[PDB]
Symmetry: C5
Amino acid sequence: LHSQANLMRLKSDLFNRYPGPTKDDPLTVTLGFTLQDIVKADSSTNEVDLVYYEQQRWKLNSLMWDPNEYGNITDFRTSAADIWTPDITAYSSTRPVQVLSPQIAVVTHDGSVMFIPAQRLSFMCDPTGVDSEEGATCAVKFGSWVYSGFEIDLKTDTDQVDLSSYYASSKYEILSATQTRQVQHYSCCPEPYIDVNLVVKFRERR
Amino acid sequence: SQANLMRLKSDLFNYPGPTKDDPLTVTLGFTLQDIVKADSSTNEVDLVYYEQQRWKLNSLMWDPNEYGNITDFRTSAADIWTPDITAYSSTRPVQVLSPQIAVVTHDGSVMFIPAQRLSFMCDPTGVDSEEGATCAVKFGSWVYSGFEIDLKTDTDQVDLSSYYASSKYEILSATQTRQVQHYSCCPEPYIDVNLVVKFRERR
Amino acid sequence: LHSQANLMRLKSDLFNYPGPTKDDPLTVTLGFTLQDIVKADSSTNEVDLVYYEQQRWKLNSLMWDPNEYGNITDFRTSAADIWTPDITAYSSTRPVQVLSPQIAVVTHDGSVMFIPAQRLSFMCDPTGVDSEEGATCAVKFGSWVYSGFEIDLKTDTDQVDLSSYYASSKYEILSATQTRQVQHYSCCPEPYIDVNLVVKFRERR
Amino acid sequence: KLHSQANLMRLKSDLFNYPGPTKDDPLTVTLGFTLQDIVKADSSTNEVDLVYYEQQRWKLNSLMWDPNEYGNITDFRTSAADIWTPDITAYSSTRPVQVLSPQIAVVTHDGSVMFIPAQRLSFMCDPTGVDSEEGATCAVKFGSWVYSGFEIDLKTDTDQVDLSSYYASSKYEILSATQTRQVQHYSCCPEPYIDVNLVVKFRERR
Amino acid sequence: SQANLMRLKSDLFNRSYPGPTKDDPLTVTLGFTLQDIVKADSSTNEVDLVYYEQQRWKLNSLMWDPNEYGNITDFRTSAADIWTPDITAYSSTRPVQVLSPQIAVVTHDGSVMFIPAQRLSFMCDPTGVDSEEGATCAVKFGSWVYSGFEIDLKTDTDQVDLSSYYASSKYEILSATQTRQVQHYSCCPEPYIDVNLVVKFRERR
Ligand SMILES: CN1[C@@H](C[C@@H](O)c2ccccc2)CCC[C@H]1CC(=O)c1ccccc1
Ligand SMILES: CN1[C@@H](C[C@@H](O)c2ccccc2)CCC[C@H]1CC(=O)c1ccccc1
Ligand SMILES: CN1[C@@H](C[C@@H](O)c2ccccc2)CCC[C@H]1CC(=O)c1ccccc1
Ligand SMILES: CN1[C@@H](C[C@@H](O)c2ccccc2)CCC[C@H]1CC(=O)c1ccccc1
Ligand SMILES: CN1[C@@H](C[C@@H](O)c2ccccc2)CCC[C@H]1CC(=O)c1ccccc1
């Protein structure tokens, strides 16, 4: 019972009292993808639909505390709406992302945050060769829409997409799936933007 | 009578979810109402069902004698904490087919029974045979591990007593089973109730 | 401004109810006007209807004396500004699509009327629709969370209003009835009330 | 510049900080349709989809002001949500209307308001004969859902639907399109309701 | 540095913009980046595009001195925190779908840049797409409610940016131009400004 009034004393003290990153306050977001399924490939429009979850990690000094003086709370679940989250976007989506999981994140006492939204995405992809041995290869990069490498940097823990939850009876078998940090330039802006590029080769099952 | 109830609600409302120190057990039961569609071009199947959810909070307890012998009441689910029970292998956002209103009883227990339509990952191969198709989908808290939310069932049988009698697909069997599993994000295990459905096309 | 200010003052007073109970129960009267059977899907056994649903109920908490409020006898209000019953179609397969403005009318005796137009997909096997005998389907409506002890349902007629049915629909209506029923549900000991809409239809000749 | 926006921000504050029409204080709404396109005709469901915009004009004494007491301001743009708007609805839609334009109205100093939303509407319509020289004919009426002829009256400026912006390469050519005020009874209510009936004759382009 | 920023945004927002007037007009620069022609429907004559709409404008009310806010020169903010122009496609057939965060960048001289990604269905007869010559379609963009006297438009170039066009699209772009036009509409005596996007395209191979 005391435990609950310690948490709401913490949540109140952190929240009731962060404008996003700046070049003076740069931030690094670690990204990693777990591909659950390739649902559909449309060769009349060259759209492919993926189901996956995107693990996101970042850290802020604004959210730090000392467990010692909050009944030894080390972390808490909270709405993603109640905290700053990064605007990590797919570059070649052809439809708005459909969110498949609760929008709840976990804040740890070192100020570190973790969010793992599950999503359905339609993206630009030519499935030619998916009915052949070689299969088809498509790619899609993910990055902050409005924050350049000076404000938001990206990182991965591995270049292999997690395939351990891939749906074993999908219409499409995964032949490879990698995730790789890149740096590119864009017409709007002198400054470079960071992406993590998701490349997947796939073909029709047996 | 009415004054008692509007006093009770304002008293009870004016809980930050479960913690390791204060865990919660949620009881789950499924009632399968219809297998609407089986798509063999994308391997997706669409179900209409209820998700019975039961849990209990000390913070929602009261003495009926102090509130005109009121023992329970209806409230919007938005007025109370509800569990983030999610299908692991959905391919589209869940569509809610019923009012989201729960019932709280004086012992702090809550019952909530939403109707939903879910598209999930399922290969219907064999649905046009005697032996039918078989698919599974597991349900659980997205963000709470077994240390914060535990699950249980009262029965391993999915309720088929209202299943639509003229559906395109007849149900051969449907079971609900609690499992424990690990996920890459986290060292703590997460609990699920796995729904396994066997079905085929109607005569 | 004098009748305008009398209405501001009235809506203030009334709006500034925890739903029905066993002690303070409620009767909702329902009627359906079927405008169209839009689509029958025999690959999924789903049929789509367009109709409007007249709802009536009465709260003592919405009563006022017109003499105290400039002889105002009734007013239009947003459905969100008042309590509305949770009348739900039992066998829907998609969320209900609202086709009309969500505005109710409250009268000085506390009665309320609300008449939402809706597109509904519900579970229906349309087999026989291409024969002289036609197809037959049913969908029942009722409170999701209130039993017969908290909400009762009534109809004025068992005939669905077909006077606005689309004359050039793909589907011709052989009959349409609306019938009050009392039934038990697994969740609960106490029976719930429904109004059962039974439509009989065939492909246009 | 600064001053004229000081006066505008004043006016809006003063006007915004009306319960709809009553029998004692009824309102006349003028309606006019501009048909942009017949997008689709579905003879499997007898539904037709139109894109059009709906000109709405009405006048309120509560929105009246003196231009001379507010820096010679004679009108302003405002969010359609910041004011009362009429609940004009199609009687035979088969799907919720989709709004294709910003929801912004213009209020003039005499209390008059104009609002011209673009919409896509599916409504009940048997396209039988769209592939003949005579074409198909369909009708849909528009009116206040909850206000009778005692509360809201409807009028048109012309019985001709504006076809000057009809899409020249539509799948369907317009033979005629008219808008006509009618009076009718409905089961719910002893009071008659007003509608403007839009009658369109069309055929396949060839 | 955090403090200065949260001091600025606070200063700019909770202490003042009512949109443009005839007395205080605004010029918006528009540029399009065509990403993909996704679909061409010859049964309904609709074509779906994915594109950016680069928008620039400038407000005196959004100006500040960097020396009074720790030499801050710009900042990111949600599109909802500020006024944005109501730039609309004239001939869309469905509501626009937003594909990117709605976040803008404000600079100390009061200038704003906003680059939303969108998918649009618009009116387009794709006859000829299966030929060497291809199909031609056009769609104009402008303020829905502001005339040339309130909002003017300009382009930075006649060339639609094709440098990110999807290389394996079903349709290859033959040309794409963006041209400012002036037009009168039935509602209003004043002329309304548009930027007209004209795209020539054909099936790939
Ligand atoms: C750079 N950005 C790209 C998208 C890009 O962020 C991206 C890169 C990789 C993966 C996803 C998105 C497309 C056009 C929009 C711009 C960012 C942008 O919107 C902006 C706005 C105002 C000032 C400065 C920048
Ligand atoms: C564990 N979880 C699974 C979903 C899982 O909760 C589940 C299990 C069974 C049935 C449905 C969902 C997918 C990936 C996301 C993680 C949980 C998760 O989102 C999280 C976020 C921050 C900190 C700790 C955990
Ligand atoms: C009884 N009810 C039916 C729906 C039922 O209300 C109904 C009846 C006729 C027509 C439509 C709906 C489906 C399963 C859910 C339950 C109501 C229900 O959700 C509930 C929740 C907590 C305590 C007691 C009851
Ligand atoms: C009159 N109305 C018609 C629609 C009608 O307004 C209409 C007429 C022409 C074109 C469109 C709609 C359908 C059924 C609903 C009723 C009005 C209505 O909703 C109501 C509600 C409470 C009290 C009194 C009236
Ligand atoms: C002029 N306008 C056009 C749209 C037009 O702004 C446009 C032009 C080019 C490209 C897109 C939109 C269609 C009909 C609506 C009117 C503007 C309009 O809605 C209005 C409303 C009240 C008072 C004055 C004007």
